[PDB]
């Protein structure tokens, strides 16, 4: 499995593969990702940090942008409190094993030269395009604010100012990234990770929607969250439990079952798991049990590293 | 005529009179106005500079903002060229007799503290309100840009950052000023001057609509412009020639006429002129002739001061 294929594993799209292949030849190459700081760090975050680790193992210098200023524009509170949550997020990401450079957006996003280019980009970006780019990111607001259309330009200029080779994010970011590729003289390679479904199956996993597993949830919390989750027999699309099996579990995987329900089942790949589940050969309750227990084990070192701090 | 009434003369509104009366008691008081730099300086500009002179004679420190950065946001070109036109505008205003402090917006509008407050205001300003405030200011654009909604916040923060007591502008500015009075902790007194009608009577006088008299137009140019202008007998509303008589001419005024059309007519006030014109006792052609000749004389020292430079 080449470095390209390691990077591509479990991504939704790379814009573009040819461009990534050219970046991979260089000795010095940088990848970055920004996060609005979040009170809880969940599996959606972890999926993305795992992708940054892949890039790091492929020789990329990694930068994690603690996006305090964009969080501010997106109505998450006061900068000082946002920054505090940002420092906590850094600790969690470090507990996930990511050794990287962490920078607050506001360290550079208020520089006169940054601002002037934001205003320069504002002349080239229609209100219509800016709002469309924010549809999956902007806080719900019946009276949308000017801040909502500043946010995407801020993000677009961020890739430019810092000179990054590769930008990583969830698929929600793809319209802002498309805008950046259209407006900036250097085209940034964009790696988009899938958006995980919330545990109740009704929307996307989100720290503000209460439908997530946090990386530091207790084992009994993880078990109860998964026990309650949407997981219809034979359906994989929009099935959060199957997504967790796909994106976080190591294979081969042994699903423990009572003898009276078939006894223990060993699954050599997610793909085999998907066949078993689609064929209603594997029952939701047994899938849930295996997913819960293997997820607890995967998250335990993170939870424990954070616990050692207390 | 008290200082208050001198200031109020020929204004469309003061927001608010009580607030202005309190400002007038202070020893130290500042008034400012911003202009997007303009290739030609016209009677609309002059009307506003005349109002600033009134404020100066009432003891106000006067600041003229050469609004290079807002002009940039409003698609008037590159900053360097905008700034050059700004320096020309300063010379014209000086030739009008205005001794004041001239500052380019960009000297302070890119400071980190300015920018942060712009983003702070962007959180409090809806897109809907921002666009409505720009309806009479924004360049025509079938695909409105993010820059259009940054502009009004920029202007709102300008009154705050510099600590001005009084903001002056045309009535086109009144929604931005209303926004500033709602959002800022110190309420700025707003003096709004009337918007002059264009010479063809179809819209407002504008340096981009070719419907203006420039302060440095030649006498034959002024004569031809006025000769062609909309000026229907007995109609004053939307009559640019009557507006020029109201806002620029000194009274008493002697309208020269051939004996066969009544001979010379002396008019002691604009109000008397309006009666004569409404009663179709004064013919458009004779009004035009007097307005043209008296306007030439009023503008001559300006034209001549600018000519001396060549
Ligand atoms: N939009 C990202 C945060 C983000 C990503 C990348 C960025 O460059 C910036 N930024 O500029 O502040 C911000 C999110 O939804 O969490
Ligand atoms: N508000 C949109 C986009 C969005 C999704 C999830 C979120 O957590 C946030 N947010 O809080 O910024 C925003 C929605 O509900 O789909
Ligand atoms: N809006 C004014 C220009 C202006 C007036 C006042 C101001 O404070 C600023 N500004 O902030 O740049 C700009 C015009 O239409 O010409
Ligand atoms: N574009 C609007 C507002 C406007 C009026 C006059 C103007 O000169 C400009 N302009 O050029 O910025 C803009 C209109 O035509 O009414
Ligand atoms: Na080498
Ligand atoms: Na005194």
Curated annotation (Swiss-Prot), chains A, B:
Record-stated family: Belongs to the class-I aminoacyl-tRNA synthetase family. TyrS type 3 subfamily.
Where would I look for the motif 'HIGH' region in this sequence? Answer: 37-45
Residue numbers binding ATP: 207
Fetch the Pfam families from UniProt.
tRNA-synt_1b
Q: Where is this site: Interaction with t-RNA?
A: 143
Do you know which PROSITE patterns this protein is assigned to? AA_TRNA_LIGASE_I (PS00178)
Please provide, in alphabetical order, the Gene Ontology terms of the cellular component aspect for this entry: cytoplasm
Top-level taxon of origin: Archaea
- Please identify the protein, giving its name as recorded: Tyrosine--tRNA ligase
'KMSKS' region (motif): residue ranges: 204-208
Q: What is its main location?
A: cytoplasm
Oligomer status and interactors: Homodimer.
Q: Where does L-tyrosine bind?
A: 32, 36, 173
Q: Which UniProt keywords apply?
A: Aminoacyl-tRNA synthetase, ATP-binding, Cytoplasm, Ligase, Nucleotide-binding, Protein biosynthesis
Catalytic activity from the UniProt record:
tRNA(Tyr) + L-tyrosine + ATP = L-tyrosyl-tRNA(Tyr) + AMP + diphosphate + H(+)
